[model samples]
Target: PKDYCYSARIRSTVLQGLPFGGVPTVLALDFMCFLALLFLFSILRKVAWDYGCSWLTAIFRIKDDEIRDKCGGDAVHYLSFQRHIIGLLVVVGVLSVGIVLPVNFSGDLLENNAYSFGRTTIANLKSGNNLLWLHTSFAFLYLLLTVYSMRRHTSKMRYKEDDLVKRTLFINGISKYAESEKIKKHFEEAYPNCTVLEARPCYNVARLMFLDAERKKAERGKLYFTNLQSKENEAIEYYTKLEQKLKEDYKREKEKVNEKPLGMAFVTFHNETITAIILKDFNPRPSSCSESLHISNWTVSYAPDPQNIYWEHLSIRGFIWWLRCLVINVVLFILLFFLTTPAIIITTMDKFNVTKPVEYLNNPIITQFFPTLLLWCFSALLPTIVYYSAFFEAHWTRSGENRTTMHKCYTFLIFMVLLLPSLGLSSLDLFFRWLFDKKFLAEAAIRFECVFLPDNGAFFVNYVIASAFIGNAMDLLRIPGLLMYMIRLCLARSAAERRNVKRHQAYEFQFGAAYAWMMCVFTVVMTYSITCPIIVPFGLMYMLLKHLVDRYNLYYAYLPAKLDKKIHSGAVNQVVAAPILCLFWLLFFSTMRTGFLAPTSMFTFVVLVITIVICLCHVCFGHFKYLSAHN
Candidate 1:
């Protein structure tokens, strides 16, 4: 099946092991660039944030309240998510470096594993080696620590800005006849203790909005011409008169429609009494026995941020509207799936073997880490595409759109970053070989998991260094970001245009993509924690440095994310997946984990059984808060 023939530097195996002709000059120069950029941005941040170059050095002096005030509650929560990464991996760091690394160092499995970075990984251990006991032991400890920490943090780190939002409840799916006053009555009757302050039901202004946009476009043309020419030249008059007519029609339609309601309304309350109960816990089910077929009714929850309510899909209906959304989703999936094929092709460079052709190319840095850089480029490119694509789905609130985007972006990232790389890096080769049989395929799959995945540890290590360190430094330096600003700056004709250009790039934090990015990195780090224990420190570096870089950016460089607790809980909730994925990889590593698997399975069963029984005892006794929905 395999004939590497002869390359003077490195030997090849059946599956093609880690390359031995190692020169990581790419990573070294990459490190140099990263450091240079760091120094550059530190000086840059000094003058940019009202001239305190020393502020970069004193990151600790900046507190949670500062981020809370400067970047909103969401920034504080983001920092906490970074802290969670740092904290969990601190434990992984302890176990991996202290215990697992020594085992890998001493492990005696494959002879070729003694060569290169492969020496420092679990790939050096024999399949059924006794040393794996320690690996499993520490892996078990990490999972337990995660579950405990996640539960504690979720309950504690909740950013309670809902107190501000408490005065508002967005009620949707109400009848059109349930006008502003009707919504006012609905809430007042529901909660007699609370006074209903105001009600504003929304309506279809689609045509009105379209006319307004045309009017604004005409206004922009008029303003642009007036800036350059004499008033008497009258080019301004043509566009100005057109804008005037368009504006009147816009106002006419806006005022004339029965406001064309599609069951959208937000109720405001003036509350002296702090009541947790909303229509939320009591999901009001209203029955319409009459000819209410067209009327949408009975839904309420938290109010979306007022600036974020969506209008397009709210009015569009019939088979075509829903069908369009469904087709858009499928098309999105197809486009996103295509993004991975190019990245997957780079991975096959290892599979196809480049040792011979690279004699012409001689930069072992290119040979060794060229893959990581290309992978990093694709990884960095994807999340933004998916983030903006969620807009096409026409979610009712930008907030919910972001929430959904965060969910899907993480899915794409896990596949691109973690899944295919670890489980299916062999890609077509692995599957093609397994095509003949289902029985031995089981054997080959574990062989793939147990050996190939961890064997590629050096690549992942290089990946973290390139992306986490250098990529963050690039972001810190605004290498690409400022390039965009300057390009837009060139397009500006005057001071107003310059101001418009500056205003457009608001330095807003993309919370959806950003949260998914960190969590994906954490999962990758944790997945390899057992197999390639050396990854622990690098993973921590990813966590620790990301925390620092973002802290600096959010404080001085960026604006508020304007996110909700959904982002917070969403990020925190993903904490379980890391442990769950970690457990999965460990169990799948080899059936030879017989010693490890049996006890691990037994322990899991015992923990599962007892936590429930123990929870019942503790909750029924002292914690009525746990038992009651009212709390």
Candidate 2:
């Protein structure tokens, strides 16, 4: 009777294998360390926030001669609201992905119920028959919800023309009308309701040189600060002289006016509706030599937002943008792939001795902590590099830059951070398995369900616990940012310099990076939800904690970089990619579980149908309806 109930395990010999000694000892030590850290952070946070940044100011000996207001902005905090919503979605999305895990993996394997994994069970039910349907249905609904959210966001970003001259037209080939007045008269006469606000020539050569000189000066300033030797004095002197020469050149070039116009003008409209009509309307060619020209002859289009325009490439050809994107994408992919090998090497070295420096690297405590630290450090560094690379790639618009960089970061994270690391861990597991018994590899090939899946699940468990839990716990303290602020304060030379440092310390939310991070988190949750249900709680906790901390920071500390209300299409791209990747993983793991070489089931067909439908709905109803209206 006692053996029949699982609760009787407390008294029975079946529970004897449990590690009662080392397990409780580890937990006790961790708890004590957690309390100590919590106490330390509470004091530190209050010191930084409430006590005027405390000893950081005292040690730095900062005089409050000029406490500047660097934090003032629109005060609306609309971007923060947007981010908070996304953060909630991240929590809800991960939780939904994990909802199926416990339902399918619960209870004893030998039991006679639906949750059982015994060999005697029906083949279809045992191999995720009903569970797959639930997953598909959830995915379908999630896709629709995500599409709707994107639609609402895009709609909010649509350009509104409420005043005269708000609707603008941009045109090139205006060099034919070399005189500014002549071009204005031509446009105004051609379209009665439109008014050409400004018709000016764009000069590329001087402007390019000026901008290049500015960049060089900024670089030299950084070098001067970094190098404290006598060589730095030379650098500062050279920089000052270079700046004077550039300013003189700029002044001389500004007054000179011999060069011909490169042919571009901004034509503004008197009303909101006429610009859209003129964009669609055109003049017919006359039969005589004095022919009326079509709007298309001038390459007419709506002007981009002033904030989004890349001034350096004001008249850049379309082919150049495409060529640059292609070249950069290839380079980015190679970088992503190359980064994986080093990551795998570093992670492996932390866990095991493979070569020289074994004595230094073999510390158990350091090795245990090092892998997580490496991952967090890499995560921080790679995003910044990808961001600057995106900027340097010469994207025509800010939105385009953000979107392209987000995709690049997403690929880097999924491939370099997630997939490659998982594969490396799996290979390591296989190595250990092979060492113990070569037959295990042969058996794993036949029964993929029992071998690699559990190992993969174990790896993800450690990752979720270490990265999500420990990393986020440290983030809550915000020690690194605070420390940086203290250093910057100490380094400030004057009121203006201190003010600049304060502005630099303020948080600038990287929308593209945020979107990419969410997608990676989604991919991880969806991939491992079935195989590793243990990760769900950790992921959920991290998102919730992240949201709370971010919300607090946004309300009190962070300021918007700009008031330009641009819709982040990068988020839309990520939302689309998440479900599609989830479906791919579903097909992948289902084949493994079913012992099939490939996915061959109604489940695969259903997933395809849902994916197709979701894509069509998003393109037709979501993006086209809202995004096209603006972008």
Candidate 3:
């Protein structure tokens, strides 16, 4: 009787494994991550929007400082904001596309007994599988509607083609206006494509080139008149030849007096600051000018609502861009919905495969260290390494060859990280599991029972808490790290006087590559911590180190460049934000807190003192660093 009871208890506890009802809840976590991802997406998109607005205005030539000065407008700000706005919109649109739709398509291998996040298992058992489909359909509808609305809003805004031309043609604001005549002369010397229309009321629209009213042909326009007083007769010589041609044409049609009146070529007074729009590929007539409308250089010369700048701003053309965005998002939504849904189910499926019995001859380490090794290698280490490398290096902002190199480096790193860990851990887990289990493996006669189990939710609670800490810490660390990388990149890139070759950009690419690696690290650490709480402390430390480094990034090794040169010396306070967040984490987790404060009165004093001291120390250290660097 004693042996029987002991065997029964042991059977339930050791051989069977822990109650795995927590799996469905575990699967449900993808939904939680999705929610968090959505919130972050919204905040990030807003930032993108603002940055894009500012960047555009800074780069456009027509809105350059010199142009603005002449036009009595804020060209600098306008151009900078124009560039930034376009950049922001593209980024925000990309991010939005990620959450709302699946950009990458994947197949569903686990359609049978497919699980979903919306309906609880118990609810599904009571009501059947219909609710699962209903919930999925509803979620899909919601995303579709949201994307549609966002698309509609985006339709009302767009950057014009002229804006692109302005940014490209306008190099140095001062040079465009100062050497205008010299540039015109250079162009004429290189390519004398057509002559100016000498007809009276000299086609005001055709300033440099002549537009023949009758022949409808263009003659090469004179780019420069001889400045030499001795070459005065040269102008007359040129005029006499033009007159002879016109006279000959008129004589040929002497009998036909009804032909359109000949437009006699004439030269204008020298002081008229002539400007003409040139058509490189097309003819110089009104028909050709209207055909390619991109050649307009008309400046408002004053502040006007930016929305009123384009003809497409008023009608269906206004909505055309939005329609394109909507179609793209809808396609994305369908792909993501199908891909993620099946994935959720397969991952959450019964943890142990009870239907098949493991043979000792085949996979000896099936039940033991193999699983642990697999989890550690693939889930914990490799992904963490790859993600951050990619995240930092692939700058959505300004980039060049160096950034591209860094991006490639990150990709290679990710593959290496994931592959090595997975192979190593899986081998380790298999070895341990096989070495320990001899009886169940040696005796193939024993039967394994298969049954559904109920989850108690404690596993999920631990995973949630651990994940929260890792995620928050990553964010705190990433923000400062990102700022440092940006500042460094700007400095490195600023050294480039020539924009053609991009060596300076390459030098700064390392900063971004390192940031991307950090991102991966944070993500992997967070994911591992979610699976088990034991990883949380380490994740916290990793995040803390990243933050601490960023806290002193500007003052690396000793002091800072900005605070040293500039009058502002309060950067130390800002640097303390990371350590303060760290202290808050320590206080919450270490003190055994219940809700907002410590659960026990005895620990309150200790917690308060530690928090206060830590905060003070960080501030002091930051200030010391700042002062040391400044001096």
Candidate 4:
């Protein structure tokens, strides 16, 4: 048993191999961490409530209605997403804990003394055990639950009660010759039902970039302590003059728009019906056989509601934009490999190298927790790295780069932080053996199904808890918010400048990377829902803690960037397949090997086909032209 706990070798499936080692210790830290977090947070909350930092009280004190009023639909919708996940994991966690845990606990396949968390995992289950009936049934039900919940939640993101439709008809790809009046005239004449309420022509300003940098520079200038000296020689006054000169020069150039329009304009309708008509038909002019109503140069679509616009790329037309995108994507690919290679190296060496720490470091905490902590430390810097790297790709909208960075962050988290480490030697051995061993292909599938994935399950359970729950609880501290305020206040010259620093400290939330991180969490929990029922509660608590933290942060700490649009589920909607797909193979292989001809053996195929069909139907309903638009 000690060897089983201490040995670094991958035990074969045929053997009565080692199960969990010191996972309860990992859980020990989870409970203790939560207590520490809540203890500190409660103390902080009290201090903030009583003290001058009154805004911090909003985290706990602010009501839902107040958040809706102050924060807008972005915060509400974001919290709603959290609620949806919380509700999902609650149902799934109940299923796992109530049914699957009992079954795994009673299976009696694993050695009695060796199993702790393993008692609640597939590790305790024998091949062809009747207990799988419960797990397999619950697995399909969980998938159904997820897909249905996703569908149900998708309905609320629709437009408002006739307010937005009449005011918004974002027509892009306009003719360069067309200004607001010309476009207004065309709209008024072309569609009789659509009376033009407004036609705001957008222009392209390619240069005079870095002007906004001076806004902060001007803010910094407020720190001039020149009351001891003369006001004219003040640092604050000096930077303000510099900012004004640059600003006036930029404004002088901004007004001369008689020459060209940047092929884009906002067209508002007096009636919602015509706006809907235009929405259903995305044409600059009507596409009618009876009348010449098609304008080839103009390409119109639904307008996104972003308050801030990317001024420079207003007219970044077809070919150049795609070329720039491809160029940036190659760099992303290179960085993805370069940055994540360390994880792969760490994983490979972790598997192959001597794992025992020298004398003093041989304690359970050092052995069980050290690598997990180190890997987490390695992974934490990724979002920041990817965020900075993404700015090189000049996406046309302010939040455009956010989505790119989010996808990049999600990619890095899954492949680098999760997959490469977990899959480790199997990832290489598959190809390496293929090069040398002729029969490597035949058994590789069996090894993946029976050995590699199952062996990695113990570590994943640890990962799910440590990564999801504790990470979220740590965020409850709002350490960065306090740190930034302190740093900025230290730079302040007076009470006025210090007060200015307080307002400046409310950080804007990163919606893209934030959502993507949840996506990673969801994938992990759902993937292991059946395979490791013990971790289900960890995921359940992750959702609970995340929702609580998000509500608090959105209320007091975060200032919305006003980047709301058709902000439905993110990389969110389609990626449900990843977790569902993982369950498919694990369930299939677990059941198939034991019962050669039993009905339970083939039920995996049954559930998979049903899931596939369900997914297909949803895709048709959501996106396919025959049904989606109507939906």
Candidate 5:
């Protein structure tokens, strides 16, 4: 199993080389390249759209049966093998690898700058320099795919071949065998003085292994129910007697006065001890700090039955889920920080008065190139901060514990909008920069420093508007795909429940309202954050006005919903106005021929304050809207 699994992992690594390895494109191969990747992007985009698992499950060969067996048969499906997730993970992984590796494969693939694979491409994916984001993106998406595809159904089957399974088995085996051997060796060689009853357990050491054997031995010697309760009762009686003595002593010291506070405290302490004693009795064995694990033991005594013990969580892999999440986040965070370093660092330089033209910038390095570098960093981080924060901060799941259809939609939307693009940004940004002004100085300097900083920050920012709006539009286009599933369910309509039918039908306004509300937050934040530096107070003021105007348009659309005559209006589609607004900001800022017009130190402080105020306003408004709806 290990060798086969390792071989599969090795095969994947080999396959990785194909996407990124130098594949020179002559005019002849240009069309061939397109043909090769034609189905690739469309298939990936569809999976990304569906947010499904078909591609991933196919790749990893995960099946519902495999999952059901590993996870308990009775385990909630949502708790394992979530809808569309496998597909999203696969698409993200494949697309991230496909796009970034080739993009990073920097070197002279050919002499022409236009044809170069890595060195002078719009973004060099190979140098591991420019579009450093591609690295994080690739790793993160691959990790997600690996972890998601690798999940074992813990509720059903015993074990399998994935990372977690291997980890669990390895840990269990070590604890069962190797760790005990080591401990026995230690005791025989070094710790012969240790007595079993008096030996304090090694709390943090290889205790689980030795402790497991001891626990097994201990369990074999069954507990006498009467004696177990009797031990607890003894402890409770001893504590009660001590408490009474203390109370008498306190009363004698206090001249026998039952002060209300003291009396109340005594009663509370006494009752708490009684409750603790009862709980301890029910629990029986004090949880072994070293040898102990909390396993659920269910009991039934209908006609009289022995307590049933269902042991689980003996595997160490259970503790490692967050480790994967951490690795993914750290990679993501570092990449973003580098990408946006220009913005983050440049924003700070205002303190050093570096925002003003550098007096020492007379050297060709500073003179001809300083502004370019400064602008590059600013531009790079500008959109990155917006895109990342919007995605990271956006409410991804509904509050209820039980997953609802809306919750599924929310997950699909999140994976589609945020997760997919983070992977695709490397490709999308490269394609855009390639397609438009590949030689733009602004683009080059940012790309150069970014290698040092190594982020696709600028490209990422640039792509946010395109990805969020247009990419999202593309994603929503797959609503028709869900029709097949719905139709299947509806076909069994002989006894179709009304609630199911209604739910399957559609939620036009409410769904739109919820999704659009989230969209508004992201759109507004992205627009305002990017535009703020251009005109601090003034820009913000205008945005607030614009938001009101936009809201009014939405309100007007809502008012007209009563129109019976197929009330079709192009007004809502004009939400394209948001992108137009984005373009307007882009042009407006890019054309500015002044100093970094953003007020520096004090100005940033003031802008931050204003940003906070605007955020508060939104919060207040949203709260009131929620309240009104409830009322």
Candidate 6:
């Protein structure tokens, strides 16, 4: 019975793991050339950033303050030079890996089932030949640069702009001093240098009242027109009177709010120094008020900058906002899950060519580019919906709104763009193999890993390359945005409208979205780095191009919705996530492989280096510098 079961399992595993045909060696050769091109591209990109920086300084008269404060003066300059060094390092590193590795006849290495042939083949597959060490080493270097960047970013920053927000405060729960004049008087008396610039309620009571009145008016009109139509003229008269009364109520509600004060006030101080002092020390409840306000209530916070105010849902009640958050989360989940189906279907079609119609559609030239185009379109299309969804979900400030949408979109991208399609393609491959070869059923799990993981890895290699080059080109061109701007200009009725259109033309770039996508690329690179060293160069290329483009956009085109640099911490976490996962997977695989010591030790060494580097940064640059730098 044991022999029969073992034999059956062996047959099943063979059928499952057997490749349909040889791995396309032409693609492999093309992939190598692509790597070389990426190396060249990275070099040229550094040159471009250097040239562009010089040009920007000349044309814009970009002064030292603008350069230093906005772009991180000495820090960016040092990092920029370091990037050149690192680019060379990556380029040299890749070239060395390419040259050092055995490049023999294509059949053994390039075959689809190459790794599955035997234990020796699998050992060769898992072994990195020390190429993995390059990525491992570079990861530490990148982390160090990032740490240094954070240290410099937070060290004694100077803002040239005399922004009022620095001297302003939002004092919440000032319901005790309901009158604006009283609140102003109280603050002026408490701190001689301070004055309340505006006192407004946290809730838009007047607006709600007006809305209620309008609803009543609408109801009265409906009764007069439909239900009351068959009745006497008395019904019409009563309805008309009711509508008039509601209109009066609306006007009274609007006027009352303008005349009276609310619960919150925008308090301004003589200077930022005084503002900071008050923010730190002032407590009004103990001195003058009857009751003590909890730290959660009647609190003073730095006023959001005028430009950063997302006014639409800003005045909503706390419970309402919380409810909206819950609703948005549920909707986001539904959206991500539902959208995944189409992406899976799309990916399955590309991989399997299952139907005659799909085979015809999957032209060799077109197939190479189609998945990327679909993903690019998705990246472009989905953000708007997510942004509005965030806006409605009750973020108090524009920064919050942007951050919320950025995170939501990132989650959507991960599931829909990365995970689902890969799973779908894997499932399709297994299904087809099972249909044709009965042997695949017994050792299904092992077969899935052996056959599907590499296929998905290869697909992602293409996806990343296409996204880096093609997606970036589209972003740089902004063709759709420009066309829409042109249409708006043509339709503009006045100078103000045109100015509004022009203002909107300055695109708001989300760091969160950028970080998320960067994480995606990093994840892809980290996953495949050891197995397919060819992808490392392209990963480098993507980072280089994206950095150059993002910097340029920041300078001229992109309007940063929030000024805080702390958000980059989210990016750091994302950047680390993939490497951490890579470490885990490598560790797991190492335990199974014969030559576990070499790769596992390399991963451990990398982790140790990263930890030591970060520790050294903390001691030298100041502890918690990255977190506290913005403050």
The lDDT leader among the candidates is 1
Clashes of 1: 1
lDDT for each candidate structure: 0.62, 0.50, 0.29, 0.60, 0.29, 0.50
RMSD of each: 6.6, 9.1, 24.4, 6.6, 26.5, 11.2
lDDT (10s digit) by residue, model 6, range 1-631: 2322113234333222222111243244345544554444344334234322243343244444554476444334323432443354375336524542232112132233333322112223333434445434544444444445445444444443446367678776667436556555565656656655555545455364446657676676767576646653355666677677776777767666555434566766666777776777754423342233232467788888767774445566457768878888888778766765654455445444232221243433343345445665675556666766764676767766665566667666666665565556556655654443343344533322233332424455566676666555545554213433354447646434344333445444655656666566666665455444455666776677666555555565555444454354344444444555444444434433323466645565557656656645753685563432433
Write down the lDDT that model 1 would get.
0.62
- TM-score ranking, best first: 1, 4, 2, 6, 3, 5
Give the range where candidate 1 is weakest over 10 consecutive residues by summed lDDT. 1-10
Against the hidden reference, what TM-scores do the models get?
Answer: 0.75, 0.67, 0.24, 0.72, 0.22, 0.59
Instruction: Give the lowest summed-lDDT range of ten residues in model 4.
Output: 6-15
lDDT of 3 by residue, 202-256 (tens): 1112211121332222122222233333455455456446656755665555544
The number of clashing residue pairs in each candidate reads 1, 0, 58, 1, 24, 2
Clashes of 3: 58
For model 1 the local lDDT of residue 530 reads 82
- Cα deviation at 329, candidate 1, in Å, is 3.9
Is 1 or 2 the stronger prediction by lDDT? 1
Total colliding residue pairs, candidate 4: 1
- In the range 411-493, model 4's lDDT, one tens digit per residue, is 77766555565455345433332332232223433322123332335556667677655677666665444443354336645
Query: lDDT tens string, model 1, 464-485?
Result: 7777777777656652235333
Displacement of residue 237 (Cα, Å) in model 1 is: 6.4
* Reference-based lDDT, residue 391, model 2: 63
Look at candidate 6 and tell me the lDDT of residue 517: 65
Model 4, position 335: C-alpha lDDT score? 64
Index of the highest-TM-score prediction: 1
